[PDB]
């Protein structure tokens, strides 16, 4: 009946076990278990709760709780405990409040240090600006806020899928100069790259060009018409048209080449390359087919004189039955080319047109690392898919919720509901803070139709995202460790644990549905990728809960809901087992990786896996061993070590001569020039092949 | 011969006047000036110096203690305690510079650029040697761009060896790319190269003789077109066709470059300063490239044909090539003249005058920073591939005010400040030498500075033997001349001898320093980035209003003629030709304002020809403003903080186009309004040839 107000302000519940555990840790800090002490501590714990429910009756602040516990335990003739209690209190408070911009950092790039310092000062200011309880929980790692380096210090926006059709149809303004529709395809891709540059400068997330072929076809047609007019002017009467064709094809290639190099040599205010993506696969006429062929060709040819594989843009390849799925369909050549590209380089992904439409709500290329949106017919009734955004994400700790329960389901749900309360508060604060961005502040995104509509300076920014137009995502991770700590390491054979995971995901989805219906903004459960947050998550978890079996001894946390990477099942059963996790209602973001051996000579196996996977689950990623050592000339996979990689034959590790690329985030990266955290390193080292076969290509 | 160590590190000579002045000033704040009181203070100061002379190397804290004790013995409390409190107030303000600075329309990327700048400035001020730090903060000198340096070992500007990169290939981001095969790829490579260079140096960037090194790639493109037309067109017009096609291609390539400069936004968020130099076209391809660049500049940017504020265009005039009407390049100069009267750019550079002034001809880097003739160990002259290392500006007008109309003490204090500046230069170059090539591999170990280095080797080997340069700046020759020899000193000859003596002493000091430290130090005329604002504000606060010195709330830039009176351009040039030839060689430019020169560029041609033999660098300031609401061309009336059309009055940047030359690069005030230290000087700029400044009214 009584309720407790907290240092933060959350009307948390009241219990008697937590105080006991607190005194036990306090006593163990210096004194050993000492069964006498261990047993006597129950006595003064019960004395403390007796004091609180006899003296106070309704609303207790933390202040009096602290005073009562110290006053009562002092008389236990146990000064070696009270002093340590106050010691821990003061040391924490000092360490928590010693998080100001006075932080000292007294072989890397130059702009990266400046942006690192800017991010540090932004983090300090933001943590000083956040609401109390959410900030406290983030500091203890109960929930992981996202991108403190940019938000909420500034009204940033996470990731938006640009509407290039509106740009290239109506024109826009960049820097000092406005632009009119392009008159060719080379200029078209050039200004597409420029828009990518400016948008990525004015945000902190992804940049996805959806259905590039469909909106790039008319400009290729314009180029072909111009070339045909020139041919009529000069070329002979017998073979004009062919000329155009051939020349047009070359132009297409040229244009795409520019793109493949323009956004590869592009660094924002952050020294890190912005995360981008391209999508294609809905081509009917000749021009779209040629543009897809050109994109795949420039990808497979590689970059540089050393034929090094490319990292960006992210490439997807939508697959639609009756268009590019079967040998009879008039696109099998495009699928063959894309499949060869897949077996040679770790790209592209696939989009199951029919099943993604059925499950997600419509057909929308993965905006950013993995966040899919939701269908949204507009005011006029026409569905709009280009111009949406994502106001933010934030990870909510599942495994700590599980492991704090200590083998009880009933406690799990109440801690879950409380966390969700904190997550709701954080979500509301983030969207409200974003809602305070003047359009004139960043005209590239608002004032000139980046999000699909053009708004005057005097207008506000709510009109762009209201009525479930924008999305805010809430995130989860660890499903496997939750199920393992609750039902044992090997739980996939049984069904009760799987129903447990399905039920908890369903509860999350229902909570997001209620929130979305209440606040009018769309809220979706979203499988947050582990770029480097998994290392901080694991480190805080092992600092708080020690070392436990199979949950933390791996120094990393299994991303989202994927199978345990230590296990090696066939891909078929992997998709069969995972097909229901996002189907149940977790469609916010998903990515299924099936591990291969080197199939450059046998990409037919990859083809079979992709086909079978059409009806099971939409997204699909491929991990083929494609690294290479330039000095000794070797291709295949590299044996991981302790804090890097090395080629099994020699051992050269200098990135100047060895190209290794691993699917570290949802987007792959180079673990040689940008040494990531220890956790991702260990997790990559643990990944186990998922299809038996040869790996080494040429020693 | 008594030595006193100053507060920080200076061993300045001792005097008794400053002691009186200090006591008099300490009396002024409360006690009003009266002959009795000032005579009392003089007696006290005489007592103080008597006590001082009552072993010869005294500290400063001792002097402060002495003055406190004697002022107390003078049986007056107000002045002494006020002096002490002024000392505490200043010291608290001297220490108030800490990251804690709270900065709690301003586009997203900026705010963090500004915060990083303030943090770097605070760290650098706390880092650099003490005495020059005090000199800088007190306004004695100005250290340039304290935000970027010496927090990071940056560099000012350079002539990137575009020839070396485009010949032997280079690595950018993740791709090691070899030489191009077409002019479009060549200019795309140039744009990417400069974009990635600008993220590794604070100051400007430039490329010289662009056509001269771009000719072979134009030839390659023409060869490819001819080969492809060998079988695809009739035998008679084949060659002709190629020509036409190649011409258009060249235009296209250059077009791309222009826009690819406008869309550059580094971590600073302000477009990097960038200059292009050409004019040595001999064969057909270089002529075509020059024509293309001039055409793409006159045609403007965007559908609104708004002028390009960037990049800088420098056109070199050579006798016997593009000067006489019979010369083989007069049409190129006609296009250049039309471009110069329709838009601000380009500027000029006489071959003979420049090669005589600074050894060997080379386009300036940055705003106006020039170089000196250099030869390497192999006796081969090279200009592209050498770099600057930043400037620090002196303050002549402060010295003039401190002289109190006395010539003899002026040179003593000037020598003192000169030594301070030497210490500053030495520290800056030493700090730069502490960098490592791996910091910015593009800028150092991939040809951007000429020689290609290795990781294991340092960078000093790229700077010794007077290859790099460390320029030292000056400002306000007119200010000191006006303070000394009256306001109207132009007709007088003695004052001219005096100011040229200042420049000569500066040159001699620079020459001695260069001979000693093995790095080419040079005199320099500082571009008014922000120096006018800060210098004028500090001088007005300290020395108060002075007629024709600070009442204009602006400081005359370098040696330039007075901006408040209008002589004929020919006589301006004949008066100004003495300054750079006398030794002011490190950087210069001669502004020459004209009315609307449309429908008659003959006056512009005449002044250019007249300025060939006299000076090296000259710029034109014809009014080019335009307003779109009422369709007006001409000039805009300055106002308290901006500009507007004299007919209607609209002033927003979205519909007006006002451009006025500041610090070399044009810049548009409506986009980014400069501080009110320059805006009061551009308003004070007076047309320098009679004629209408309007071109067309609207309604
Ligand atoms: N559920 C609970 N209700 C009330 N008091 C509790 C509960 N759990 C622990 N306590 C008591 O709260 C005391 C305060 O812990 P602490 O000093 O961290 O304060 P706090 O308000 O919890 O601050 P924080 O949120 O930063 O942890 C503990 O020493 C313990 O005795
Ligand atoms: N060595 C120790 N380790 C853990 N806790 C200790 C130790 N020594 C004393 N303590 C006390 O036990 C408390 C346990 O931490 P905490 O504040 O998180 O607990 P709680 O308040 O019950 O948790 P919550 O804040 O989530 O309600 C410390 O805040 C401190 O008061
Ligand atoms: N030329 C001089 N030589 C010696 N003492 C001087 C001279 N000029 C002024 N002083 C005395 O030095 C005293 C100390 O001045 P102040 O408190 O500014 O210290 P400082 O060493 O000059 O520091 P800073 O260099 O930062 O101004 C003055 O009050 C004045 O009496
Ligand atoms: N109102 C006032 N204005 C100026 N100086 C004052 C005032 N009141 C007291 N003073 C004293 O007079 C000093 C004059 O400035 P400062 O100390 O820089 O003189 P200085 O030592 O002669 O110059 P420098 O440090 O450049 O050699 C102040 O630092 C302070 O000690
Ligand atoms: C090269 C380039 C062009 N543009 C813009 C400028 C124009 O508004 C626009 C259309 O450019 P283009 O398609 O080049 O059109 P154009 O009018 O020059 O005609 P042509 O077909 O003869 O070339 O693209 C950019 O915005 N950025 C760039 O980098
Ligand atoms: C388009 C582009 C190319 N490049 C580089 C890649 C290559 O190393 C180099 C030459 O490009 P290209 O001359 O286009 O090379 P290519 O092999 O495609 O030949 P062709 O044009 O005859 O089909 O330019 C950049 O560095 N940046 C760019 O934006
Ligand atoms: Mg607590
Ligand atoms: Mg090519
Ligand atoms: Mg002083
Ligand atoms: Mg064009
Ligand atoms: Zn090897």
TrEMBL record, chain B:
Gene3D superfamilies under this entry? 3.20.70.20
Which molecular function term from Gene Ontology is one that the record holds? Answer: ribonucleoside-diphosphate reductase activity, thioredoxin disulfide as acceptor
Keyword Acetylation assigned to the entry: answer is no
Indicate yes or no for the key word Lipoprotein: no
Q: Which domain of life is it from?
A: Bacteria
Ranges for the Glycine radical domain? 565-691
* GO BP annotations, alphabetical order: 2'-deoxyribonucleotide biosynthetic process; DNA replication
On this chain, the residues bearing Glycine radical are 664
Domain ATP-cone stretches:
2-94
UniProt entry keywords in alphabetical sequence: ATP-binding, Nucleotide-binding, Organic radical, Oxidoreductase
| Pfam families with a match to the protein in the record | ATP-cone (PF03477), NRDD (PF13597)
**EC category:** oxidoreductase
The Gene Ontology CC terms held by the record are: anaerobic ribonucleoside-triphosphate reductase complex
State its Enzyme Commission number(s).
1.17.4.2
Check the record and name the InterPro entries matching this protein: ATP-cone_dom, Form_AcTrfase_GR_CS, Gly_radical, NrdD
- State the name under which the record lists this protein: Anaerobic ribonucleoside-triphosphate reductase
Gene source species:
Streptococcus thermophilus
Q: What is the lineage of its organism?
A: Bacteria, Bacillati, Bacillota, Bacilli, Lactobacillales
């Amino acid at each position: 009946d009584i309720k407790v107000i907290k240092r933060d302000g959350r009307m948390v519940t009241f219990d008697s076990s937590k105080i006991y555990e607190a005194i036990l840790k306090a006593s163990e800090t210096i004194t050993p278990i000492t069964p006498l002490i261990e047993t006597k501590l129950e006595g003064i714990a019960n004395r403390v709760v007796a004091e609180i429910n006899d003296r106070f009756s309704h609303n207790i602040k933390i202040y009096e709780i602290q005073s009562i516990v110290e006053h009562e335990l002092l008389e236990a003739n146990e000064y070696a405990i009270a002093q340590e209690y106050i010691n821990y209190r003061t040391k924490r408070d000092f360490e928590r409040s010693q998080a100001t911009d006075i932080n000292f950092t007294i072989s890397d790039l130059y702009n990266t240090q400046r942006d690192l310092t800017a991010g540090i000062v932004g983090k300090s200011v933001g943590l000083k600006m956040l609401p109390p309880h959410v900030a406290n929980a983030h500091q203890k790692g109960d929930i992981h806020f996202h991108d403190l380096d940019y938000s909420p210090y500034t009204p940033m926006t996470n990731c938006c899928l640009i509407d290039f059709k509106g740009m290239l149809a109506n024109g826009f303004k960049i820097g000092n100069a406005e632009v009119e529709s392009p008159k060719s395809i080379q200029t078209a891709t050039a200004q597409i790259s420029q828009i990518i540059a400016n948008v990525a400068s004015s945000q902190y997330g992804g940049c996805t060009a959806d259905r590039i072929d469909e909106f790039l076809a008319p400009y290729a047609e314009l180029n072909y018409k111009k070339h045909l007019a020139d041919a009529k002017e000069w070329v002979t009467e017998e073979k004009q048209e062919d000329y155009a064709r051939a020349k047009t094809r070359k132009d297409i290639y040229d244009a795409m080449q520019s793109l493949e190099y323009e956004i590869n040599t592009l660094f924002t205010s952050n020294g890190q390359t912005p995360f981008t993506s391209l999508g294609f696969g809905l081509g009917t006429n000749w021009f779209e087919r040629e543009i897809q062929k050109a994109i795949l060709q420039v990808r497979i040819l590689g970059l540089g004189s050393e034929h090094r594989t490319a990292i960006f843009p992210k490439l997807i390849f939508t697959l639609k039955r009756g268009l590019n799925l079967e040998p009879n369909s008039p696109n099998y050549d495009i699928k063959q080319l894309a499949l060869e590209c897949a077996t040679k380089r770790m790209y592209p992904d696939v989009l199951s047109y029919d099943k993604i439409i059925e499950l997600t709500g419509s057909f929308k290329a993965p905006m950013g690392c993995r966040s899919f949106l939701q269908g949204w017919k507009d005011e006029n009734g026409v569905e709009v898919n280009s111009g949406r955004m994502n106001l933010g994400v934030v990870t909510l700790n599942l495994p700590r919720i599980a492991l704090e329960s200590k083998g009880d389901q009933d406690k799990f749900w109440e801690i879950f509901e409380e966390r969700m309360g904190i997550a709701k508060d954080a979500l509301v604060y983030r969207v409200e803070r974003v809602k305070e961005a003047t359009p004139a502040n960043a005209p590239i995104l608002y004032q000139y139709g980046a999000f699909g509509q053009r708004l005057r300076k005097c207008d506000s920014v709510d009109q762009l995202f209201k009525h479930r137009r924008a999305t805010v995502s809430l995130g989860y991770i660890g499903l496997y460790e939750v199920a393992s700590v609750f039902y044992g390491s090997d739980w996939e054979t049984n069904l009760e644990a799987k129903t447990f995971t399905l039920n908890i995901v369903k509860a999350m989805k229902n909570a997001c549905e209620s929130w979305s219906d209440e606040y009018d903004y769309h809220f979706s459960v979203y499988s947050t990728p582990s770029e480097s947050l998994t290392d901080r998550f694991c480190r805080l978890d092992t600092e708080k809960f020690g070392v436990v079996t199979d949950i933390t001894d791996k120094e990393y946390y299994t991303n989202s809901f994927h199978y345990d990477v230590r296990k090696n099942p066939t891909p078929f059963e992997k998709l069969e087992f995972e097909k229901d996790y996002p189907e149940a209602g977790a469609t916010g973001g998903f990515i299924h990786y099936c591990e291969y051996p080197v199939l450059q000579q046998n990409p037919k196996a990859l083809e079979a896996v992709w086909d079978f996977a059409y009806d099971r689950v939409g997204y699909l990623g491929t991990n083929t061993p494609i690294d290479k050592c330039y000095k000794c000339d070797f291709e295949g996979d590299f044996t991981p070590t302790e804090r890097g990689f090395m080629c099994p034959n020699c051992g050269n590790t200098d990135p100047k001569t060895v190209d290794v690329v691993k699917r570290t985030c949802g987007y792959l990266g180079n673990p040689q020039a940008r040494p990531m955290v220890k956790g991702r390193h260990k997790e990559i080292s643990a990944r186990v092949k998922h299809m038996n076969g040869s790996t080494i290509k040429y020693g």
